[PDB]
Ligand binder design. Structure first.
Ligand SMILES: [Li+]
Ligand SMILES: [Li+]
Ligand code: NA
Ligand code: NA
Ligand code: NA
Ligand code: NA
Lengths: 368, 368
């Protein structure tokens, strides 16, 4: 049997990675066979599409993963490559590993692996992880998880020395003018807050550069409508170039870029465009996340007790079946409930000090 | 001159703390004088209201803080107590400390102090911090910031052994039935996601407890309308008790509570109500926050370089004047811009490896 590779991609970006992998492999093994969940580019390179990538871009997903667990198990491919899409591929990679199939996960699932347990899962599910960036490999090295640093595909696609004048000709920007790119972000929460402040920033810069060109790449129609509506109020008399996409051209053309996304900062770096990164998130949200990172807890009872006195179910674990399972023993109103009751009473006593009087004493001691 | 205490409160909760402090102080110094920014309860206890607390609950706030900086400086009070409201009081406390006035900050500003620099600011601005909880004092101990643990006022207000049957009589809950409290949260992002899953959780629990009473404390009319609209779709045929406020009664009455807020978990603890805490936040948001906590950076260029190669302005620093100030040197398109250009070129080279070929090699090595 010729080399048989199973592939799963769940987004256009995965389809691009998959197509490039298939071509490079065919240079070494022109008789290789490719099958799995393929997008149009992977199919163009010859991947048999048991399912279309669009079908993964919940109940249907579960059924597909079950069917693929069965069929790949029967096929016994030489290698299975999960291309990103970790919510789908990590579990699938684990099911196939259970059957002795060699698995690779392509792209570090940084957002998905939000706690240590998920790092362990990646290690159990894969024989190797492919990471775009060096600090991602260093991360997995600390966990004894085999990881190969392969570089970033966007660095292969973008030249070391891009042509600023060419990008300006495409966008219609004069070569003698200073140019500022505003990238308020791709997500909604980002655009709302940061759009107004980015516009105000440009207004301030116009006082120094009265002929400053301002280019705003907008990723889709909804995001465009959002930015226009914000600009109508904040700065209706500010002239800017609103673009449909074309963020790469805007960055290559500009003399500086104001970015919301620390992720788009990579493409800005490869564009050789100096940048400033401004970002805001809800303080309450950041405080809660930081509390979890620093203590592994989120609720005050557990911080006061120093253990998981109270059951905390977070992120994917905050799910009806698990919540109900955690509440049943407590609704019983039996021994375990009385034990928690007693502990709550001790903690209550520990923080019951007549705070009003304490505060008054502290004032008086500082005053004397 | 009799004891002269300056107070600033910016919310109802601060007004309550202030009133209790004034009364306790008057027990030791009946001739004490109180002045500052007072709510109705502080005024009832005799606080002279230069400004009303409602006036702080941006341009107006700046003017008031300026006026208070002047007048308190002239008054030279024995002590100034900033009651919570850290966005306003920490700066004011610093201005007064500059003039030799002794300052206390009441309530740990946990959300406000989102990074180490702000901890240093609290220390510089205050002679003493008053913390409700022991782990808050331990935190400030690590920074050599004087902090007194005074206990939590809510623990003084709530009895060690509340009357479950009494709270049930208030709410109209039968004494023989099992009762579940659903507290989907006080904020909007919380209610949206967590409301549906909390309702589904209750539906599951009804399969075991067909006569389970379900009480839902809703903090205001908007939040109520939100929950009702979610319930119309998710579970219109589920009978629940929708309450206007009365979260304390609901928790004292219930046999178990399902809580979104790790903060309301304290009041649940003092109610002696066993609880399960379920919470979700946007993974992308948590990933970004965790990245910042772990590395002090948010943008990929700085993670790749290992320093602040690129200027990052986050939270209160993400502000037009500072953003424009950071962009001016780059728009100049001079020496500093060319230096960043050169560094970007070196980093580009470091991640330019022909990733497609690397991935293909890794597949082939694993297949052989
Ligand atoms: Li105490
Ligand atoms: Li390389
Ligand atoms: Na121009
Ligand atoms: Na959890
Ligand atoms: Na009942
Ligand atoms: Na910053």
């Amino acid at each position: 049997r010729p080399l048989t590779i199973a592939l799963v991609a769940g987004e256009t970006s995965g389809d691009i990675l998959g197509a490039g992998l298939i071509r490079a492999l065919k240079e070494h093994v022109p008789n290789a066979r490719f099958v799995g969940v393929a997008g149009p580019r992977m199919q163009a390179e010859g991947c048999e599409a048991w399912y279309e990538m669009e079908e993964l871009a919940s109940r249907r997903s579960s059924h597909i993963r079950a069917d693929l667990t069965k069929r790949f198990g029967e096929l016994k491919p030489d290698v299975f490559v999960g291309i990103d899409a970790p919510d789908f591929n990590i579990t699938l990679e684990g099911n196939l590993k259970k059957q002795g199939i060699k698995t690779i996960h392509y792209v570090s699932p940084s957002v998905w692996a939000w706690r240590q347990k998920r790092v362990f899962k990646i290690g159990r599910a894969t024989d190797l992880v492919l990471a775009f960036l060096p600090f991602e490999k260093a991360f997995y090295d600390k966990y004894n998880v085999p990881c190969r640093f392969i570089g970033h595909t966007m660095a292969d696609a973008m030249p070391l020395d891009p042509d600023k004048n060419a990008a300006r000709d495409v966008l219609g920007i004069p070569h003698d003018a200073h140019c500022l790119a505003l990238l308020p972000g791709s997500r909604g929460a980002e655009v709302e807050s940061l759009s107004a402040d980015f516009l105000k920033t440009a207004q301030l810069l116009r006082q120094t550069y009265p002929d400053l060109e301002i280019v705003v790449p907008l990723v889709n129609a909804k995001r465009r409508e959002q930015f226009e509506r914000i600009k109508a109020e904040v700065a209706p008399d500010l002239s800017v170039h609103l673009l449909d996409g074309m963020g790469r051209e805007a960055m290559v053309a500009s003399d500086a870029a104001l970015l919301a996304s620390g992720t788009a900062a990579l493409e800005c770096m490869l564009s050789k465009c100096p940048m400033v990164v401004g970002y805001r998130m809800k303080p309450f949200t950041f405080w809660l996340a930081k509390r979890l990172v620093k203590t592994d807890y989120v609720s005050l009872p557990n911080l006061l007790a120093g253990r998981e006195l109270v059951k905390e179910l977070l992120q994917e674990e905050c799910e009806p079946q698990k919540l109900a399972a955690a509440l049943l023993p407590l609704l019983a109103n039996g021994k375990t409930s009385h034990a928690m009751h007693d502990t709550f009473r001790e903690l209550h006593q520990q923080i019951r000090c007549n705070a009003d009087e304490q505060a008054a004493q502290a004032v008086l001691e500082l005053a004397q």
